[PDB]
Amino acid sequence: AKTRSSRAGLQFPVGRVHRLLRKGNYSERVGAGAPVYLAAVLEYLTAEILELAGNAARDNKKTRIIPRHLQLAIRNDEELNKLLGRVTIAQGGVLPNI
Amino acid sequence: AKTRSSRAGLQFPVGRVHRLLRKGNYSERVGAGAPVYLAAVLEYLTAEILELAGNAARDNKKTRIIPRHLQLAIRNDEELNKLLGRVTIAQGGVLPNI
Amino acid sequence: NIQGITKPAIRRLARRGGVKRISGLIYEETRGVLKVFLENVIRDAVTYTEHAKRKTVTAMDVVYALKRQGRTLYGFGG
Amino acid sequence: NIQGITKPAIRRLARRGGVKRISGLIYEETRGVLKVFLENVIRDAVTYTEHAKRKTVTAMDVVYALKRQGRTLYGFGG
Amino acid sequence: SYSIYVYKVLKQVHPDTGISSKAMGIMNSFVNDIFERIAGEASRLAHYNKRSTITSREIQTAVRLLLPGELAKHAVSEGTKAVTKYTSA
Amino acid sequence: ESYSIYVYKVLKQVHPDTGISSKAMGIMNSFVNDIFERIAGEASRLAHYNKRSTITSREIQTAVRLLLPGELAKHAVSEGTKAVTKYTSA
Amino acid sequence: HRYRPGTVALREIRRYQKSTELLIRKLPFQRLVREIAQDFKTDLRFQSSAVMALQEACEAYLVGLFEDTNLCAIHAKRVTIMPKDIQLARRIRGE
Amino acid sequence: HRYRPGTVALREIRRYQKSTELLIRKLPFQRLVREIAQDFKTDLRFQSSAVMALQEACEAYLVGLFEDTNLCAIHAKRVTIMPKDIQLARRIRGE
DNA sequence: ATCGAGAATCCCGGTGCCGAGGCCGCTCAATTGGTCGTAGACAGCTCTAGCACCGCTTAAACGCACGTACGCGCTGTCCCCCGCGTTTT
DNA sequence: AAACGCGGGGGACAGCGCGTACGTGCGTTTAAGCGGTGCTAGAGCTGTCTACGACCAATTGAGCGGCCTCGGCACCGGGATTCTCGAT
C-alpha cells in the first residue's frame, strides 16, 4: 500500500482531504487531482505560518510556539493579515501600537 | 395531477424549489416539507416587499413598480434594510438625507 | 450583572486599544455596546443549542454563532 | 483614462452622498480610491472569465466578483 | 425565473399595480439570494448535527438565524401553515 | 480526527528544534479547517456557475487565485501544480 | 442676482438624492474599465451589461463612501470633506 | 514623587499591548452571560469553554472598537475618547 | 425675527406621442402520482461526568474620597479657496 | 467640461474659563482557589418503521414569442414655492 500523500510528496493527508470533499456536499463528483492540489495548498499555508511563528518564538527566546507567536506572525505580514482579516486568535493579544 | 404548490396553498413553485434544493449540493437527502416551508417563506418575503413597493409607487402617483420604489420600501424599513444591508439595488438611488 | 464590567476593566480594554485618556461617560456607553454584542451572539448560540435538542450551550454553538456574524474565532474547535 | 472621471462627476457623486463643501485635493483622492475598487472587482471578474475559457467578461462574472467581495448587486441576473 | 410567481403575488397584494422589467430583475435576484442564504444555513445545520437530510426543522432554524425580528416571526408562521395544509392535502 | 500530526510533521521540517503548545495547535487546526472550507466552497460555486458536476484541480487552482492574496496565491499555485505533477508520475 | 455659497450646493444635493440616474459619463467609464482589464488579460471583450454592472457598483460604492466621509468631516466640526476624512472612513471600514 | 497625568496611562498601554491575558474578571462576566441567555431559554447550562469562547470574542471586539474610537478622537484633534467617537466608529463599521 | 418686491428653482397639468409589459396562443418538459426498497430518525436505556451548588479561606481588585493638572469648547480673528457665474471649447 | 473673476462663509489657529478625569491612598467587598457532592443532561447501543428515495408517464402549468393599447416620457402653460435684497 502506497499512500496518495507519499505519491504527491506531501505530509498532509490526500486520502482524508478526498473524503472530506466527497462528504462535504461541495459537488456530485471529485477529480483525482483535486485532493492532491488542496492538500498541497493547505500544507504550504501551514508551513508559511509555522516558519514565521517559530521565528517569533526564537525572537522571544522561546522553544515552543504559543498563540501569541501565531498572532505576531499573521499581523506582521500584510498578505497573512489580509487572508485572516475577520479572524480572532484566542490568547493572541494585539500588536504594540501607540 | 395536483401541484404541491396548490396542496400547500402557495403561488411559489414547491416542485421547482425541491429540485433546486436536491441539485444545489446542500445535503444528501431533502425532506418533503422542506421545499413547502422554503417556498412559503420566499412567498411571504416577496409579498412584504411588493406591498411596500406598491405603496411607494402609489405615493409617487405611479401604477408600475420601478427599482426606485423597491429601494424606498427596503431602506425605509429597519428589518428589510438589515436583511438587505450589503445589497445594492441597481437604479435604486438613495434616501433623501441632509 | 452589567455593573460587574467595572470601570477598571473597561479602562484595561481601552489601554490594549491604545487609548490614553477616557471620558467619564464612556463606561456606560461601553456597557451598552457590550450588552448588544453579547445578546446577538448568545441569541444565535442558543438557537443552535435548541436545534440540537440540547440543554447545554457548547463552545461549538458559540463558534458557529461568531462565524455567521463575521467574527470567526480560532482556538475553540474551529 | 482615469482623468475621464471629471471633477463635476465626482462632485455629483458627493452631492448624492449629501456633501455640501469639497476640498480641491478630494478629486485626486477619489480617483485613486475608485481605481483600487475597480482593479479588485475586474481582477476577480476576469478570473471567472478565464475559468469559463471565455474571451468576453459577462455581467454574471461581474455579479459573482461583487458577491464574493461582499458587495452583492441586484438587477443584473443575480 | 420567478417572474410568473412574483406577478401572481403582486396581483394579490396590489391588483391594479404592475411592475417594470428592471424591477422584476431585482425581485428575481432577491428570491435567488434569500433561497441561497436559507439553503446554505440549513446545509450547515444538518452537517453540524451529523444529519444527511434537510427537513422543515432545518429551514425553520435557518429562518430564525437569518431573518431579523418580526420578519422571522411571520415567516415561521407562513412556513408552518403551508406544511400543515400540505400534510392534509 | 484533527490535523495535529500533519502540522507537527510540517513544523519539524521548517523548525526541527521548535515545539508547539496545545492552544497553538488548536489555532492551527481551526486555520486548516477554515481555509479548507473557503477553497472547497469557492470551487463548489465555480463548478455550479459553469454547469459542471466535478470539482477538479482546475477549480481548486481558480479558487486559490480568488481567495489567497498576492504572492500567497503565486506560491500556493506552484505547490499545488508540483504535487499534482509528482502524483500523476507516482 | 447671486446665490450665496452653499445655496446651489444644497439644491444639487436635493436634485441628485431624488434621482437614480448614473452620474459618471458612460464612454469615459467604459475606457477606464477596458484600460484596467488590459493588465489582467489582453484582447478582452465586454458584454454591454458587464460595463453597466461595474458602473452601478462603483457609483454605489463611491456615494456610500462620500456619506461616511461627510460624517467624519462633521465630527471634526467641518462642513468641508478633505482627504483625511476619506482616509479615516476607509480605515474604520477595514478597506 | 508624582507622575504627570499621561505617564502611567502610557505605561499601562505598553503593559496591556504586550500581554494576551483576559482583562474582564471571569466570574462577573459568567454571571452577565447567564443573565443574558435567560431571556432566550430558561434552565440553560453552559460548557466552561463556551463562556471562555464568549469572553475571548467580546474582549477582542471591544479592543478593536476602542482602536477605531481612538482614531475618531484624534481626528477631532482630541486625545480623550468620548461617546460621540464610539458612535461614529460603530456607524461607519455598519453596526 | 418679520415683511415685502424681484427674480428664479421646482411641481402641477393639459396635450401629444410612443414603447413595452399584459393577455393570448403555442410548445415541450417536468411535477405529481404510484409503488416498492431501504435507511436513518425515534425511543428508550444505560452510563457517566461536568459543572451548579455549597462551604470555607484568602488576598487582590473595586469605590470613594480627594488633589490637581490638563484638554474642551467656545470666541474671536486671519487668510484664503471652492463656488457661482460667465465665456469658450 | 474647462478656465478665469470676485468673494465671503469657512477652516485653522491663539486665549482662556473650567469642568473633569488622571494619580494616589484607605477600607470593602468580592472574586479566585480549593475541596466535595448530585444529578440531570450528554454520549453510546440497539430495535423499526416511518419517511426518505428511484423510475417513470403524462398532461398541465409554465416559458417563448406576439400584438397591442395604456401608462410613461415629453413640451409648453402657468402656479405657487424659495431664495436675495432693503427696512420695522
Domains annotated for chain D, with CATH where assigned, are 1-78 (1.10.20.10)
Q: Among candidates H92, H73, H93, which has minimal Cα distance to H83?
A: H73
Handedness of CA A31, A33, A35, A37 (dihedral sign): negative
Whole-angstrom distance, CA of residue A84 vs CA of residue F47: 25
Q: Identify any residues that bridge with F19 across adjacent strands, giving them in sequence order.
A: A64
Q: Which residue is nearest to nucleotide I72 (CA to C1')?
A: H78
Cα distances (angstroms) measured from residue D50 to each of D71, E32, G64? 22, 25, 31
Strand locations in H14-93 (E):
45-46, 80-81
**Experimentally determined by:** cryo-EM
Phi, psi for H19 (deg, rounded to 5): -90, 165
Q: Among candidates H55, H57, H33, which has minimal Cα distance to H46?
A: H33
Cell matching residue A44:
504550504
Cell matching residue E1:
425565473
Buried b / exposed e over A22-48, threshold 16 CB at 10 Å, is bebbbbeebbebbbbbbbbbbbbbbbb
Cell matching residue G62:
463611491
Asked if A95 contacts H7 with a C-beta cutoff of 8 angstroms, the reply is: no
Q: Is the CB of B5 under 7 A from strand J?
A: yes
Asked if F86 contacts F78 with a C-beta cutoff of 8 angstroms, the reply is: no
Q: B26 and A25 in contact by Cβ < 8 A?
A: yes
Q: What share of chain G is helix, strand, coil (3-state, %, to 5)?
A: 65, 5, 30
Q: G88 and H71 in contact by Cβ < 8 A?
A: yes
Q: Is the CB of C51 under 7 A from strand J?
A: no
Whole-angstrom distance, CA of residue B67 vs CA of residue B74: 11
Q: Any idea what the CATH number is for the domain that residue G66 is in?
A: 1.10.20.10
What length is written for chain F? 90
Q: Identify any residues that bridge with E51 across adjacent strands, giving them in sequence order.
A: none
Q: H12 and C12 in contact by Cβ < 8 A?
A: yes
Q: Is the CB of B1 under 7 A from strand J?
A: yes
CB pairs under 8 A between D and G: 163
The range of the structural domain enclosing residue G55 comes to 1-95
Whole-angstrom distance, CA of residue F72 vs CA of residue A74: 13
> What positions of strand J are covered by protein, i.e. any atom < 7 Å from a CB?
1-2, 7-12, 20-24, 30-32, 40-43, 51-53, 58-63, 71-72, 83-85
HEC string of F27-55? HHHHHHHHHHHHHHHHHHHHHHHCCCCEE
From the CA of D27, how many Å to the C1' of J7? 23
Helices and strands, counts by H and E, chain D = 3, 3
Q: Any idea what the CATH number is for the domain that residue E79 is in?
A: 1.10.20.10
Which residues in chain G are contacts of B72 at CB distance < 8 A? none
**Domains, chain B:** 3-98 (1.10.20.10)
Asked if C6 contacts H29 with a C-beta cutoff of 8 angstroms, the reply is: no
Q: A97 and C73 in contact by Cβ < 8 A?
A: no
HEC string of chain A? CCCHHHHHCCCCCHHHHHHHHHCCCCCCEECCHHHHHHHHHHHHHHHHHHHHHHHHHHHCCCCEECHHHHHHHHHCCHHHHHHCCCEEECCCCCCCCC
Asked if B37 contacts E87 with a C-beta cutoff of 8 angstroms, the reply is: no
Which residues in chain A are contacts of B25 at CB distance < 8 A? 25-28
- Running DSSP on this structure, what letter comes out for residue B35? H
Cell matching residue C47:
438557537
CB neighbour list of residue G80: distance below 8 Å, 6 or more residues apart: D21, D22, D23, G73
**Angle, to 10 degrees, between the axis of helix H48-75 and the axis of helix G83-93?**
180
The range of the structural domain enclosing residue E63 comes to 1-89
Which residues in chain C are contacts of H50 at CB distance < 8 A? 45, 57-59, 61-62
Asked if D45 contacts G49 with a C-beta cutoff of 8 angstroms, the reply is: no
Q: Which of residues 64-93 of G touch strand J (CB under 7 A)?
A: 73, 76-80, 82
Handedness of CA B38, B42, B43, B47 (dihedral sign): positive
Q: E78 and B41 in contact by Cβ < 8 A?
A: yes
Number of structural domains chain F divides into: 1
CB contact B25 to A (< 8 Å):
yes
Which residues in chain H are contacts of C15 at CB distance < 8 A? 9, 12-13, 15-17
Output the CA angle B81-B82-B88, nearest 5 degrees: 55
CB neighbour list of residue A89: distance below 8 Å, 6 or more residues apart: A67, A70, A71, A74, C74, C75, F27
CB neighbour list of residue H65: distance below 8 Å, 6 or more residues apart: C17, C33, H86, H89, H90
The neighbour count for residue F5, using CB atoms within 10 Å, is: 10
Residue of chain D with shortest Cα separation from G30: D1
At G45, is the secondary structure helix, strand, or coil?
strand
- Running DSSP on this structure, what letter comes out for residue H79? S
Whole-angstrom distance, CA of residue H88 vs CA of residue H95: 10
- Running DSSP on this structure, what letter comes out for residue F87? H
Whole-angstrom distance, CA of residue A86 vs CA of residue A73: 16
Q: Which nucleotide comes closest to B16 if you measure CA to C1'?
A: I31
Whole-angstrom distance, CA of residue F59 vs CA of residue F43: 5
Q: Which of H75, H84, H93 sits opposite G72 (nearest CB)?
A: H75
What's the reported resolution, in angstroms, to a tenth?
7.6
Asked if F39 contacts A38 with a C-beta cutoff of 8 angstroms, the reply is: yes
Q: Identify any residues that bridge with D21 across adjacent strands, giving them in sequence order.
A: G80
Which residues in chain A are contacts of E43 at CB distance < 8 A? 25
Q: B70 and E42 in contact by Cβ < 8 A?
A: no
Residue F39: burial class (beta carbons within 10 Å; 0-12, 13-18, 19+): buried
Contacts 24+ apart (CB under 8 A), G13-19: G13/B98, G13/D15, G13/D16, G13/D18, G13/D19, G13/D20, G14/B96, G14/B98, G15/D15, G16/D12, G16/D15, G16/D16, G17/B93, G17/B94, G17/B95, G17/B96, G17/B97, G17/B98, G17/D15, G17/D16, G17/D18, G18/B93, G18/B96, G19/B93
At D53, is the secondary structure helix, strand, or coil?
coil
Residue H55: burial class (beta carbons within 10 Å; 0-12, 13-18, 19+): buried
Whole-angstrom distance, CA of residue G29 vs CA of residue H56: 46
Number of structural domains chain G divides into: 1
Asked if A95 contacts A75 with a C-beta cutoff of 8 angstroms, the reply is: yes
Q: Which of residues 11-50 of H touch strand J (CB under 7 A)?
A: 25-28, 43, 45
**Helices of type H across chain E:** 3-13, 21-48, 56-66, 70-87
CB contact A86 to H (< 8 Å):
no
